[PDB]
Amino acid sequence: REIVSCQAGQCGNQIGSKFWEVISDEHGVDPTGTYQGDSDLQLERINVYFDESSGGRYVPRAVLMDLEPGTMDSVRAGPYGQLFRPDNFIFGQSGAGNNWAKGHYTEGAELIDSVLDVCRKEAESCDCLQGFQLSHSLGGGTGSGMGTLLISKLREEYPDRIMMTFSVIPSPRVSDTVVEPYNTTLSVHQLVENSDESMCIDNEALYDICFRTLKLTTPTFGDLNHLVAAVMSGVTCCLRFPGQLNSDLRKLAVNLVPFPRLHFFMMGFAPLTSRGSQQYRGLSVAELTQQMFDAKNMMQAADPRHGRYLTASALFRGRMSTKEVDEQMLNVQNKNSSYFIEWIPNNIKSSICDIPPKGLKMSVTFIGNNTCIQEMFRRVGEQFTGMFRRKAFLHWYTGEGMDEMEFTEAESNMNDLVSEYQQYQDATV
């Protein structure tokens, strides 16, 4: 059961960098590539994310993608950048320019063959691939278009594996790209079509978390991406360590995806404590559940009150017993039955893993297929219509090669997705 990861664009590249430093810390791997941990358990399943070399180094099974080698240079300049294999660095001459067309059809396509070659080499290097991870942004050019192209061409090469996407969705009030709706539509109608589970990050929910939950004065992208790294570590903690009730990535997929098109999830982490309030926390299973299901702790900008939980999953880590986790997961459903859809009982899967994060007595990662994803899809589609009616910024894509029919059918697919989220939210027994 091996995880091979790919990170595309700068967004995905720093997110994957932080994820790899987190995994190295968990398994006791120093930047030089050797093992200086403090227990044997860090060696039992170190092959999931690392491969031992003939130098003794534990090289990550990571493939980096960017039409801009600048982020490649930044990660190699980073503290843990020497961990990555040198030949896994795939890069080109000119950047995507935040253009899905350049990232997907002309610049990405010229390098997609090489990235497929290196990813396949990693695949046969792995003994049994449990699946692929992907980290990128839906608002970028080479993170979104090239990542979607990667996932599309790996659906037709490893369909039996589990390909996750921790895509970073954009936001109008967090607008830092004007073609975010175009790129987001073009990448969503590909992710809903080729990502078996595609769970999303909006930077504003992260800002809210670091504002009132963490209360960090000046949290840079480091502290910002640490949350995404933590949830990526949590979704595979049961894979990397023994557990009282363990699970794996495709366990999560099969227990969280009721219908093939409904696989866009939210994330959550717990515990998170503001700087100077640990003396007030209790750090128990009940507190973990409360911070799990708290609206503000969700790291995707959506309001679960306006939606309904199709299916939730709680990946607990630490020395805890199963009765309190089961009781809490039952009690939340019982007390919020208005927010759990009635035509499916006990929407919450619970998995228990031995190893808590280093320095944490107990923790939990939350995955939620709430129907409140429909508001973000509706917002992005509304912005897409707003620009498409005047066909603003469409000349870049049209001159780069794609036609208008692809855009129209992309929004048709995304509108069908949001319509069916609404249909199942309002469905009755």
């Binding site: 227990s39 009282q244 020395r319």
Partner: peptide, 23 residues
């Protein structure tokens, strides 16, 4: 690789360590 005797003051002990890997 074998596990050592179950240590209760370590974040790296298993439930099966607490149960029967005492020795």
């Amino acid at each position: 690789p074998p596990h050592g005797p179950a240590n209760m003051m370590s974040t790296y002990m298993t439930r099966y360590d607490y149960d029967y890997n005492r020795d």
